[PDB]
Structure 1
Amino acid sequence: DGPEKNYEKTLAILQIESEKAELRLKEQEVRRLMRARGDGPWYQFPTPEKEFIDHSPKATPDN
């Protein structure tokens, strides 16, 4: 084939590898912020379940 095919497939390969590179760097930035601040969907560490708190009137009033 002519030189155009290899030349333009290289650009296609370059675009993919470049975009994977920036996606790889961005994930590490996201993970760092999510783990330090706990404000994202990841690194959500468990806390006690509130559905097992008893809310009934107790034997004594001041509870």
Structure 2
Amino acid sequence: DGPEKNYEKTLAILQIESEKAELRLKEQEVRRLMRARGDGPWYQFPTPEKEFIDHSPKATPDN
């Protein structure tokens, strides 16, 4: 075919793998921040359920 094919295919492969590197490191820092502080969707550890509390009138006022 020629040299242009190899050259430009190499360029494509290079941008692909560079972007992958970028995203892997980004994922590392993202997981770090999400775990150190639960601001994000991940590492949101469970809490007690709210809907199983009874809010009705009790037997004593100062419940």
Range class of TM-score, shorter chain: over 0.9
Tell me the CA shift for residue 27 of structure 1. 0.1
Q: Give the helix-richer structure, 1 or 2.
A: 1
Moved over 2 A (4+): none
What is the SS of the residue equivalent to 2:19? helix
Structure 1: tracts of 5 or more residues without a match: none
Match of 1:31 in 2: 31
* Deviation readout 1:3-45 (Å, 9 max, x if unpaired): 0000000000000000000000000000000000011000000
What is the SS of the residue equivalent to 2:10? helix
The sequence identity of aligned pairs, in percent, is 100
Compute the RMSD of aligned alpha carbons.
0.4
Tell me the CA shift for residue 2 of structure 1. 1.1
TM-score normalized by structure 1? 0.98
Structure 2: tracts of 5 or more residues without a match: none
**Count of residue pairs the alignment pairs up:** 63
TM-score normalized by structure 2? 0.98
